[PDB]
Design a protein around this ligand. Structure first.
Ligand SMILES: CCOc1cc(C(=O)N2CCC(N3CCN(C)CC3)CC2)ccc1Nc1ncc2c(n1)N(C1CCCC1)c1ccccc1C(=O)N2C
Length: 118
């Protein structure tokens, strides 16, 4: 999940940008806090969450993956962000607050990624 002995990982120029520009800009958004940690289906009372969401993802995991050089390339790290936002749209109702919070964060994600080098 945040490290794998058989998985090749490294740090590239792009992966440094994911960590120092993308993760770090988003972590400081006032709507980011629900994504610091995995969805806790006990605390939030979500008996069906892990039946609908097959691959949970959050920014804490991503951040930790970056610090561990878990990833091979930055597009792999972008896929994790997409999973995290997409899970949010999939599980929740169209007008739920968390949907509108994920959309605002996702927009900034793309603006930052649009300036990534290479
Ligand atoms: C570890 C924090 O975790 C959460 C906490 C609380 C909470 O009650 N606190 C926050 C801190 C408390 N202190 C301490 C004592 N002191 C005196 C005052 C301050 C005060 C009350 C609420 C939601 C949380 N965490 C969450 N993580 C993913 C999700 C998530 N909430 N939301 C919600 C986020 C906001 C709207 C929806 C979801 C809800 C239902 C279904 C899915 C999802 C979902 O998709 N995600 C991504």
């Amino acid at each position: 999940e945040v490290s794998n002995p058989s998985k090749p990982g490294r740090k590239t120029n792009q992966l440094q940008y994911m960590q120092n520009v993308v993760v770090k800009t988003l972590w400081k958004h006032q709507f980011a806090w629900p994504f610091y940690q995995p969805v806790d289906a006990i605390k939030l009372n979500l008996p069906d969450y892990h039946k609908i969401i097959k691959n949970p993802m959050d920014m804490g995991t991503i951040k930790k993956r970056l610090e561990n050089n878990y990833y091979w390339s930055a597009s792999e790290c972008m896929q994790d962000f997409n999973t995290m936002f997409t899970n949010c749209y999939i599980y929740n109702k169209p007008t739920d607050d968390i949907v509108l919070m994920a959309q605002a964060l996702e927009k900034i994600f793309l603006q930052k990624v649009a300036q990534m080098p290479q």
